Amino acid sequence: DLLKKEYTGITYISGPLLFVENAKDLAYGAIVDIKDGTGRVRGGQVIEVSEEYAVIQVFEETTGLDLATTSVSLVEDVARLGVSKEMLGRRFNGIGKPIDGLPPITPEKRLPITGLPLNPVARRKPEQFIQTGISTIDVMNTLVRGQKLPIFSGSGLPANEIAAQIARQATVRPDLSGEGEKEEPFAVVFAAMGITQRELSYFIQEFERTGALSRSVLFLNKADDPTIERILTPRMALTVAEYLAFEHDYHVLVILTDMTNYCEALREIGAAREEIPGRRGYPGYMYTDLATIYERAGVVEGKKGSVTQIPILSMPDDDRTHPIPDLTGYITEGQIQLSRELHRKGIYPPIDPLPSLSRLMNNGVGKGKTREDHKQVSDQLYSAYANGVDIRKLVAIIGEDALTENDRRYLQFADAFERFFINQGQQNRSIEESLQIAWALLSMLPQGELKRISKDHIGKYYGQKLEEIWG
Template sequence: MLTGVSAVDALTTLVRGQKLPVFSHAGLPHLRLATQIAAQATAGGAPFAVIFAGMGLTHADADAVRDTLDARAAAGELTLLINTADDPVIERILTPRLALTVAEDLAFAEGRHVLVVMTDMTSYAEAVREVSAARGEMPGRRAYPGYLYSDLASLYERCGRVRGRPGSVTVLPVLTMPGGDITHPVPDLTGYITEGQIVLSPDLHARGVYPPVDALSSLSRLMRHGAGPGRTRDDHLDLAAQVLAALARARQAAELADLVGPAGLSDVDRRYLDFERAYRSGLVAQEEGARSLAETLRLAWDAVLVLPRSELVLLPDRLLDAYGRPS
């Protein structure tokens, strides 16, 4: 399933039937990213639908979501469920369940591939905590009820495919980590249930990069089942591995530059810093508009080809000759 967002499609590919959360911090553009994905995602020409479940949104955010998804609604591909911050808490608990029930009907009765975007799951978990406290139930970690794990699992595990039936349900939950704490119960428990995560970076956001996806902290555990030869393109997986490896080396070079200064770096280390700039400004930065997979992979090639061929050890010669720099 293509989202049209290069940082996701290239490096943390979303696969039909997967549950892949977005981990964010307060103040980061996670709602903008969620609505962008909901507006431009496709299923490769197959029957498709989007369910957007907003929980605890401000009225301004709710209006922005409606405006962004207007074209998808006009195409008859959108179901929108909005719970604002001043709506009853019990409605916030019902919203994702209603969204997933609609998704299951569209997927397994009508044969569509359905993307369910749910934001913000932290608001949902706080609603569960509030109702639990009102019932006088025994609190668990950070006053959340002890059954929060099974409650979240009862939502996330409703995604997938059914053998013998067309259609699929893919879930993209978005959650903010209070205080940026990834060990907070909501992201912590979500990580045990889901199949990877897309992590947004405050550092990239401070540099003005949108979407601020931290590729080295992000992971799609099903990517190898939905990308590569016969699925996306034969160079996709090897190219993604090379980009991630080069990005890790570039961060080491940046740390070294902070210690000894750029002049003290080797020529190769300076090339890795050039790669990181090309990666950040070319592949990741995407203010608006959907990118095709071909355009996304071209930008990934442009970034890695900043490096000497001797450094591209994860790319076979046949791919370098076909897509990159001939020997």
């Protein structure tokens, strides 16, 4: 209603937590306004309520607050976001306020940002093949519409350029799939958490040059912004994405810049409240908290729209067994892992195919979708590359001159594979070009060693030469 209720009587302020005693009328999970003695208003959220006292976490910094003049007032019982179709082309901060100088959005609905779980009966299988233009992804780790495919990166590796290239080059192929239906371009929902100015200025220029800002909604939480605001931002972005996808039949692509910062923000609050930790001090419920973010993608039966997620996260000390990559890989449908060793040699994009994985590959490839020899070629490349890597390891112990011809063939295959298939630069490749290059590489090996490829496909496609394409 028009009424608002005031709460004085704060008894404890320290770090990100604030304590108020006679506040039994505050619902659990409600949003509050904290008013300073100078009139400044800061946000908050109730995380524990009792008839004795209540606990409120503060989004902004606690500078200038005091126990004599501060007051707390209720905003709403459930955290909600006002969403509209007018949001396309606007920029917002980490809590949904405009920062582009334009008037605020006139809401059409007010949706809870925590969301609701999708019914497993209401889902359907994602099967539409998406062509990203990168041979290491399209052929060996195929991405389909409705998948969660995070990128596992290091400290100095170019994950942002790969994400921008994917967003620039992604398209479906109606002619191969037989649908015949053209598409409108993807709408991009961009959520940044703790991003620096150097990366943000690159992303803004990349989106400006390709003309994608007219179809994009941006949520920006910079590195000098308060830390606790990072809890809200993925939920706001995914709420807007879900509304656009399942209410107006858009095809939404979601990019989350750094989940490591989100996990650090979660760990700070968890250690403030003294939860029981998991590995390396992170709270024990981090698997559940991450699950409510990733599981908001997919495809819904009877609806045209879809949500696709590309989270980006940095592995500390390039460790795959850190809790953040481990709990991320236990939820998502695969990952794309970059290699620092490939980056040192000048290969771009430095995607390492052995640790990479795509679970939904079998649905969107095969006869009548891309081509009948996709999966067997993908498997044969993996086996041959693994043998080449093992021979590389053995050479370092026994020396190169002791190799037989069979091992030298695999060594040269691995070298040519790295120098030609992975290393492609900024060029855009169709799936047919990638398959042609892959078949050209496999022609170096003897015909009798192609165990995983059927003999009819071998008779149909074997016998190419790589040098004719470039010379």
